């Protein structure tokens, strides 16, 4: 039960990370914050 | 207890899934650099 | 284990929240819904 959850979380951790970078970038190809 | 976390990880999975979709769509729509 | 996981889940909750917000604004700024 433990591993699965942690497995799960590092994966989620990976996605959100990539996501922030993508948004950051989309934030420039428009009007810089 | 873990059914909890396995629940709070379940909302995150769903959150990340929609967020990924939204970001892909915009990425497409925006377009430029 | 648990303080770590539970703390990792908060990191995640934090970021999903930020991201959602950023994405939401990004969609008003470009007219997309």
UniProtKB/Swiss-Prot annotation, chains A, B, C:
Residue spans crossing the bilayer: none
The annotated region (Leucine-zipper) lies at 5-26
What upregulates this protein?
A: Translation is induced by amino acid or purine starvation, or during growth in low or poor carbon sources. Translational repression during nutrient-rich conditions is dependent on four uORFs (upstream open reading frames) present in the 5'-UTR of the mRNA; these promote ribosome dissociation. Translational induction occurs in conditions reducing translation machinery efficiency, leading to ribosomes scanning over the uORFs, and increased translation of the mRNA. The rapid translational induction is followed by transcriptional induction at later time-points, independently of the uORF sequences.
Q: What happens when the gene is disrupted?
A: Abolishes recruitment of the mediator complex to the upstream activating sequence (UAS) of amino-acid starvation responsive genes. Decreases RNA level of genes involved in amino acid biosynthesis and cofactor biosynthesis during amino acid starvation or methyl methanesulfonate stress. Growth dependent on amino acid supplementation. Sensitive to amino acid starvation. Sensitive to purine starvation. Decreases cellular glycogen levels during glucose starvation.
- Subcellular locations according to the entry: Nucleus
Q: What does this protein do?
A: Master transcriptional regulator that mediates the response to amino acid starvation. Binds variations of the DNA sequence 5'-ATGA[CG]TCAT-3' in canonical nucleosome-depleted 5'-positioned promoters, and also within coding sequences and 3' non-coding regions. During nutrient starvation (low or poor amino acid, carbon or purine sources), it activates genes required for amino acid biosynthesis and transport, autophagy, cofactor biosynthesis and transport, mitochondrial transport, and additional downstream transcription factors.
The annotated subunit structure for this chain is: Homodimer. Each subunit binds overlapping and non-identical half-sites that flank the central CG base-pair in the pseudo-palindromic motif 5'-ATGA[CG]TCAT-3'. Interacts with the mediator tail; the interaction with GAL11/MED15 is direct. Interacts with the SAGA histone acetyltransferase complex. Interacts with the SWI/SNF chromatin remodeling complex.
Q: What is known of its domains?
A: Residues 89 to 100 and 106 to 125 define the N-terminal activation domain (NTAD) and the central acidic activation domain (CAAD) respectively, which can function independently to promote high-level transcription of the target genes.
By what name is this protein known?
A: General control transcription factor GCN4
The species this protein belongs to is Saccharomyces cerevisiae (strain ATCC 204508 / S288c)
Origin organism lineage:
Eukaryota, Fungi, Dikarya, Ascomycota, Saccharomycotina
User: Its gene?
Assistant: GCN4
List the range of the whole protein covered here.
249 to 281 of 281
């Amino acid at each position: 039960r433990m591993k699965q959850l942690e497995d799960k979380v590092e994966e989620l951790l990976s996605k959100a990370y990539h996501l922030e970078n993508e948004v950051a970038r989309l934030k420039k190809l428009v009007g810089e914050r």
